[PDB]
Design a protein around this ligand. Structure first.
Ligand SMILES: C[C@H]1CC[C@H](Cn2c(N3CCO[C@@H]4CCC[C@H]43)nc3cc(-c4noc(=O)[nH]4)nc(-c4cncc(Cl)c4)c32)CC1
Length: 96
């Protein structure tokens, strides 16, 4: 959907080892993050590796990339905000 709630975007999370690896590949140096930071780094990961489609740039192709293994889909749109949340939550432990 869109506009995920503020307190969700601020949830403190511990990425599991695969998502941690990805985060660390774009310069993140922590064990714990907010969701908004995780999304920031994944953003950066996609930009830097150019995983977006050249012609339809809201589509991300993640087959044959680590991102593909994290999300378990061959692609997704950047407009599908809840789906993205949902795929990322599988890859982390909420901090209590
Ligand atoms: C998995 C990963 C999560 C973060 C997003 C960030 N992000 C991006 N980036 C930003 C960094 O550079 C990147 C290269 C191509 C993609 C570029 N562009 C978005 C467009 C829309 C959009 N356009 O129309 C709409 O409705 N949303 N949304 C977000 C968005 C921001 N924060 C939270 C959410 Cl869940 C989504 C966008 C990309 C995907």
């Amino acid at each position: 959907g869109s506009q995920i709630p503020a307190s969700e975007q601020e949830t403190l999370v511990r990425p599991k080892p695969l998502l941690l690896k990805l985060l660390k590949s774009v310069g993140a140096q922590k064990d714990t993050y907010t969701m908004k930071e995780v999304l920031f780094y994944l953003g950066q990961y996609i930009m830097t590796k150019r995983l977006y489609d050249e012609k339809q740039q809201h589509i991300v192709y993640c087959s044959n990339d680590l991102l593909g293994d994290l999300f378990g889909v061959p692609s997704f749109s950047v407009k599908e905000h809840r789906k993205i949340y949902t795929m990322i939550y599988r890859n982390l432990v909420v901090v209590n």
